[PDB]
Amino acid sequence: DEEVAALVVDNGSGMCKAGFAGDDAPRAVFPSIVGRPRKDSYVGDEAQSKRGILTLKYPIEHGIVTNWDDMEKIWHHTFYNELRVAPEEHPVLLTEAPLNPKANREKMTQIMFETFNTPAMYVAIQAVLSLYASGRTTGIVLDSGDGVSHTVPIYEGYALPHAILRLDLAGRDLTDYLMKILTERGYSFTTTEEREIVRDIKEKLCYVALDFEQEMATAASSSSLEKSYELKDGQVITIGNERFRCPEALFQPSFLGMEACGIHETTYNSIMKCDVDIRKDLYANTVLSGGTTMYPGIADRMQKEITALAPSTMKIKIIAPPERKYSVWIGGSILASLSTFQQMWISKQEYDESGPSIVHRKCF
Numbered sequence: 001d002e003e004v005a006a007l008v009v010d011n012g013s014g015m016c017k018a019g020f021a022g023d024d025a026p027r028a029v030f031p032s033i034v035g036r037p038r039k040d041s042y043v044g045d046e047a048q049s050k051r052g053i054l055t056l057k058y059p060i061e062h063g064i065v066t067n068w069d070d071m072e073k074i075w076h077h078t079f080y081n082e083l084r085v086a087p088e089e090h091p092v093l094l095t096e097a098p099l100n101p102k103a104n105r106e107k108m109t110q111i112m113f114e115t116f117n118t119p120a121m122y123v124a125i126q127a128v129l130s131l132y133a134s135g136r137t138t139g140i141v142l143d144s145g146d147g148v149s150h151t152v153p154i155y156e157g158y159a160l161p162h163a164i165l166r167l168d169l170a171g172r173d174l175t176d177y178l179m180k181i182l183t184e185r186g187y188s189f190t191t192t193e194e195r196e197i198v199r200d201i202k203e204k205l206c207y208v209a210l211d212f213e214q215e216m217a218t219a220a221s222s223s224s225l226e227k228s229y230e231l232k233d234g235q236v237i238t239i240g241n242e243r244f245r246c247p248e249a250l251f252q253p254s255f256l257g258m259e260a261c262g263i264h265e266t267t268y269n270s271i272m273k274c275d276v277d278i279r280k281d282l283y284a285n286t287v288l289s290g291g292t293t294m295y296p297g298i299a300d301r302m303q304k305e306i307t308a309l310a311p312s313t314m315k316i317k318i319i320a321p322p323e324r325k326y327s328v329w330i331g332g333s334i335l336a337s338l339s340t341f342q343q344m345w346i347s348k349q350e351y352d353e354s355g356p357s358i359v360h361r362k363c364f
């Protein structure tokens, strides 16, 4: 091979995924955190491990970069610590959130070429990459991560900004809600350490009920839905209706005091904002992505809820890839490996010729 490996870096609100184009999975995943004492800067797992003696910062808390100084440190960490490569020696494909401000796109571009001296780079919308990973160029993606969720209609490879909806309800909120209802049950999960334990309980024992009320009735009259969970100190606790009550908040945000529409309604509203001529393509190609869409039963629940909102004559299909937790990264690996994509990279030459603003033309 003549070309060096290209890098794929998925910038997540909670976890960053990094690896090499062509691979089937990211080589590294770490917390999008930077910490400094209350070694001068700590990034990733280490910052989390030593959070006791540090003040943590979340530079991309809700999907959008808010502090470029710390984001630069996360990227430095990604190259030198996680992937152990020199960025000046590899093209880099970066991901961005839907509705990312134009100025931010230019900033990312300038930093890659001027700070890291990348030989080439490109930036793609997360939702679009997930759609690519599913083998489609048209459809609507419901991306629910750690600090944010989005419904992104995509037609022929292009996201439709006017129809994109943002929901400030995701994995983080669900974890805290589970801590709250488990505490109401009689336990006590309130500390940061306990938040990590509940996050684990959430990822392992929660599920989306097909019918909330029926599930609540079953849990109230029997122990058939109860599951045991063992804490590190040996204590075994019981999780009952909390298993499905937690993710139910995605469909009924009021449980969290939020007036926002649930994910099914948000998906429907996005589709309705698109040209009537492509709505059927979206209904027939609703793809789920992100860690928060991993709950067992979520696909069937979405199918049921969307069917209730859409015309009776509409064909509804929910696609839930088993590997959807990393579909963004995988889509990037696929894209960066495409023969026709090689001409699309922004080269250092092109950057020197046109400057940061070239990103709008090259990465439309």
Ligand SMILES: Nc1ncnc2c1ncn2[C@@H]1O[C@H](COP(=O)(O)OP(=O)(O)O)[C@@H](O)[C@H]1O
Pocket: 011, 012, 013, 014, 015, 016, 144, 145, 146, 147, 148, 170, 171, 172, 199, 202, 203, 204, 289, 290, 291, 292, 293, 294, 295, 325
């Ligand atoms: N199996 C699972 N069930 C439910 N939630 C999960 C599961 N696996 C991961 N999560 C949650 O998904 C979120 C992270 O997903 P991700 O798409 O990586 O987000 P981001 O890109 O914003 O960091 C976290 O809140 C995590 O707890």
